[PDB]
Design a protein around this nucleic acid. Structure first.
Lengths: 173, 366, 366, 367, 165
DNA sequence: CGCGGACGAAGCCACCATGTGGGCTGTCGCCAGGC
DNA sequence: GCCTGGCGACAGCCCACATGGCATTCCACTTATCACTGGCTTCGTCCGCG
């Protein structure tokens, strides 16, 4: 359901990065920190209207908007897959190292909600840095469900990653 | 007959013991995640400091054949006879044909499937047993499938020899159940008194030659670290340690040395990058006769925070020790030693000025 | 055999060491957030000042092939033969076919996957080894997949050469475990004695050449800085440093030089914007024989504030040093040097008038 | 090889440097909040006074294309060819296709994404380079996506030219790492010796023509201000400044001029409503050879108050300078100049009667 | 904090009745913006932050203009409606809002009375009990309260723009 | 030499699926007058 | 005894800003290791111990 507010946030913000600089620059200074942190007080003008009503959903929305605006200029310039499908696409196509990125994904899958946020911006900006595609609404919904799921979303992330890597390798034959 | 030692010890941004992915090991205890140092790690640090201080060292190795081969080679054997003789050492013992060996590696003697745990001079004695029977070994070295010629009783008697570490922590050998020794020490997993979220540190190893155009890091990653005040606990079953060493005097030195190792040692995990060396903030040795009791339930309710956890952890361990001595009455000889002087901590028994004075008083009391 | 050095050092609105997002690195220690300077950074500043003062420099580089290529090119080799010869240098060593290389970049020699860490004259000697086999290199340069022709033993002996920085901080090379050197120095993460909230600093880069007299800037941002009195700690394992250098005289110069670098250097991260060059407010060198002990638990209870933290931090480190010498008795040769004269600080040993006098006295004492 | 200059300077209800909301910038240092003047501000005031006094000015601008366009337009180019030629100037350099440009604005040439920092005559030389190739520019102006025709080496050689301000404070250009210059000056954030609470000043704007049934002000607000005795510190790495300018004589003039600018200038924030133009109460130039040392820890313990902070700040900086010279022995050539004569301040070295005499003596002591 | 709110509401109606009924004690409260506040507000108290959180709001309530003096949303929505209805400038009241959200506990009491009295001057509704409790929760946790005000403010301003169209 | 314990002898069979929540508490203004 | 009312005098109104700006490159590792044991039958023979 949340995927709806998530898609509205992804659209408006995806337009916001390209058209108005002061807004995305007001968004990127809040990457990876809880909304109570004073560096986030400037991001409420953009994000606060779109969150329904647990902090888990707010942290998902606010954080993905911040990671979304912190894309490098090159990335910003240019079925529904998860972040794991985006990972496997960055392994097979863009040539990222395999033993390390699989290790980093199975490293994310153990954190709690507090830890995922700590680890995610570095990984996502790594992925985004080489034009890997990531559907932000799915990542939002997933990050909102990370709080109440012990591993119910992460397992989906890991399974899809391994599976998509196997299929991408078998299609190359 | 039970000596149990409790200890509160803070570690600053250490990350001494890592899981398989590099994160520090955690317990979700009391509903709240708390970083922990596994017992086997601190136990390894304790056994190496005890062996180094008491002088006798035991060796847990999967490659016993190769080591016996260096001793037979220094005794004047040819390299091929040394290898065949060490294979005879492990081939001559056990129920089945011999101790099972891992798949053969090129140029090197095969490792046994299970980890042997025996003192160093006992390995040398195994070399002497394989040495006296040099001609029989030479005859079986010519056959395609040589059999265990060496006497099994003599070898099994050498493999039964016990180090202080074997007497203290016990050993297990599945093919030779006669050599198994019951451990005399229970070592708990050191967890934090308070809930700890895993702190991430982002480091970048810098390239040193300047690039002509694009200067960037040589490598960049993020390693996880954490800090906190750990609770530590351990038991020593005096009846089993006396049963293992046999004489009460070597058991006495083993216990005093163990307790001192328990206080002094640190697992050394990325210590070259964190320098987590620290003395415990509080130590409490009890000499109980009925049964050992860990005070870990005292810290099941995680501490809130914002203020130094040391004083509250010591005071909370005090209240739980008081409440247990009232609930479970006993004549156990207690005693403690603390750095802080802000509180008397009356329930932890007689106060001693120093850790060695406390260890000497409670070991002399047992 | 253990020289450990403690230091209290205030930094004014520095932000010397930043995370991945620009905020200064923080530890939630004692329940309260405290900004920290990572050990890897101050260690880098120490190794560069030590190499610059002791004259010999080691190079941690991912691009060894390109550097060997400039030396072979200055020896009279053609550029293509210099590139093929340096590829032969890294191709001729290691278990597998060769040291694995990163994906090839246009117009430039490929970087090795792992960061080499070797002194500069050793790299030149690798160039000489690739030089005397010039014809064999020319023959393998014509083949499609040339193999490692150069002798592996000679190259591995060059890669084992140790700088003072290698002797002091150690190195790691996964493909060549023979070259790995155990570090002799434990460098802790310098954290603040008191809790520090990150200080946002709004800044604009005003744009000259105004378009229509409007004052609109060319840039607007907010970089976050912080200030405070850091606690710093470090160890030097004399047995390993003597084992690495071999001779005790070079280890003596290495230790004295290390301690002086520890006191003198500052990481230089964002200094031209905030000049944070400062001398430590207090230094305390102990020469311990049993084990090193950091006084970081002394500052686990964060200081309240409103008043200068220097005097209370020095006095608190004094009380914790006193209480540890009573709790853990030892014959360790202590000694300290301080700027403030308001207190005697009796537990920190004999007072010395100056930092070099203290370093010379404790190094001469070890 | 390190010249460091310390200075105590009181400012009376100034509020020279404001945050994003108008409050003066503050450090919670020593546990007590202390208003501060950011280093980039006083550094900007120093570079403008140095450029104005030494005559050569450098320009930090996001709009280089438009400026090259005025020079090509004064050289006889048509406006459209001037714009296409300046686009060729920024299009012909860098790794990628060209220096990236901000989104196009109506009627005006687009601003570069990053701030260029180059002297003025170098910009004119870029105009001459785009000028010599006028026909090639005219041919590429007709194409839909023109490429960088101009020689990259000549343009990069023009963009490497250094002003005194570039030699002194350094520059950074991410697309052209060949042009980056290491700064030779460390400029600390000037904070107060004593703790300062922000002072709210309510104010109204009178409406002059009066209308019946209304006396209300034309505007109402409440700006913020503060005052105090700031501690100031700065370094000059002589080895890097000599390395940047090349010759030691221009480095000598650059250092003496920098120190004088450091003493003379004031950031000019809200100065017309608050005339906070003031000379430093005390200055202490040390010429150190091993390493620079700021005396900021001396004022980590905030001063209590009720009495004039100047004498206690000068005396406290004196005691800390004495204690550091005893703790860290050195042959550094010291020297100071003060307004107050109530104390001798023995540790700050040889006393000089005037700031220019002190600057000339310590610069002459460093060569 | 539910128990803090009950006392806030009882103090609010007591002080409101005292403000309209007696000018002597009400003027005795307006001077503080101090013994008379101690003899009036003191019974309605359950940390120094909660007491200042009571006395400051009782003095601010007593300092209203008689237009506002004669006549659950918090203060972010009170400023949003003050923007939407009275036409009070949004770009500036937003800056005054973020400038309030940065201060600590002693500064929030330095910038609050001016904006609040400016709200009452425009007859915008301010739920005095919640503002009291929020100021009391401010000594306990500042960032949560400040963010709540900012988010609610920008959020209810947007909803009121959807209602406009 | 006798008894007890341990070991040995077999017969052995293999292209795409996921949604939930709600239960705990207390307070004044004081004094005087009239009913 | 309980309930209700009262305790010099304590001001009013008007007022609340516009505009502009919000960076960009680069870089992301290797190696080695990865347990045993047993939870069938009866009987006979051999070896060890007493």
């Amino acid at each position: 359901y949340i995927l709806q507010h998530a898609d509205a946030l992804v659209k408006r913000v995806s337009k916001l990065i390209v058209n108005e600089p002061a807004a995305r620059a007001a968004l990127r200074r809040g990457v990876g920190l809880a909304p109570e942190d004073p560096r986030m007080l400037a991001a409420h003008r953009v994000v606060a209207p779109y969150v329904p009503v647990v902090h888990a959903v707010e942290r998902a929305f606010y954080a993905v908007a911040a990671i979304m605006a912190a894309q490098p200029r090159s990335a910003r310039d240019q079925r529904r897959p998860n972040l794991g499908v985006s990972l496997a696409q960055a392994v097979f196509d863009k040539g990222l190292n395999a033993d390390s990125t699989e290790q980093r994904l199975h490293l994310i899958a153990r954190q709690n909600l507090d830890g995922v946020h700590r680890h995610l911006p570095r990984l996502v900006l790594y992925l985004r840095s080489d034009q890997v595609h990531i559907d932000w609404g799915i990542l939002i919904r997933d990050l909102a469900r990370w709080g109440h799921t012990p591993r119910h979303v992460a397992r989906e992330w890991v399974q899809d990653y391994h599976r998509t890597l196997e299929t991408l390798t078998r299609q190359a034959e | 007959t039970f000596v149990d030692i409790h200890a509160i010890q803070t570690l600053p941004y250490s990350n001494i013991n890592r899981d398989d992915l590099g994160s520090p090991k955690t317990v979700v205890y009391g509903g709240k995640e708390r970083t922990r140092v596994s017992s086997q790690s601190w136990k390894r640090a304790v056994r190496h400091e005890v062996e180094a201080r008491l002088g006798d060292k035991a060796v847990r190795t999967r490659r016993i054949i190769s080591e016996i081969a260096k001793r037979l080679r220094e005794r004047g054997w040819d390299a091929d006879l040394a290898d065949a003789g060490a294979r005879q050492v492990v081939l001559s013992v056990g129920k089945k044909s011999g101790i099972k060996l891992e798949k053969e590696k090129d140029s090197e003697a095969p490792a046994t499937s299970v980890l042997f745990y025996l003192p160093v001079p006992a390995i040398d004695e195994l070399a002497a047993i394989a040495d006296e029977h040099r001609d029989a070994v030479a005859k079986e070295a010519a056959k395609k499938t040589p059999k265990g010629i060496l006497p099994a009783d003599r070898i099994t008697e050498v493999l039964k020899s016990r180090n202080v570490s074997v007497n203290l922590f016990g050993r297990m050998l599945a093919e030779l159940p006669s050599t198994e020794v019951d451990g005399a020490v229970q070592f708990a997993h050191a967890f934090t008194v308070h809930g700890t979220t895993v702190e991430v540190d982002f480091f970048t190893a810098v390239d040193d030659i300047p690039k002509e155009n694009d200067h960037g890091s040589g490598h960049m990653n993020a390693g996880q670290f954490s800090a906190g005040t750990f609770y530590r606990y351990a038991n020593v079953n005096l009846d089993r340690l006396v049963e293992n060493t046999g004489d009460a005097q070597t058991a006495r030195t083993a216990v005093a040395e163990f307790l001192r190792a328990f206080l002094s040692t640190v697992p050394s995990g990325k210590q070259n990058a964190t320098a987590a060396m620290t003395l415990p903030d509080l130590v409490h040795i009890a000499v109980r006769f009925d049964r050992p009791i860990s005070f870990a339930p005292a810290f099941e309710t995680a501490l809130y925070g914002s203020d130094g956890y040391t004083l509250r952890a010591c005071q909370e361990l005090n209240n739980y020790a008081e409440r247990l001595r009232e609930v479970w009455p006993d004549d156990a000889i207690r005693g403690y030693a603390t750095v802080e002087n802000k509180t008397d901590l009356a329930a932890l028994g007689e106060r001693y000025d120093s850790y060695p004075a406390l260890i000497d008083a409670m070991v002399a009391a047992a």
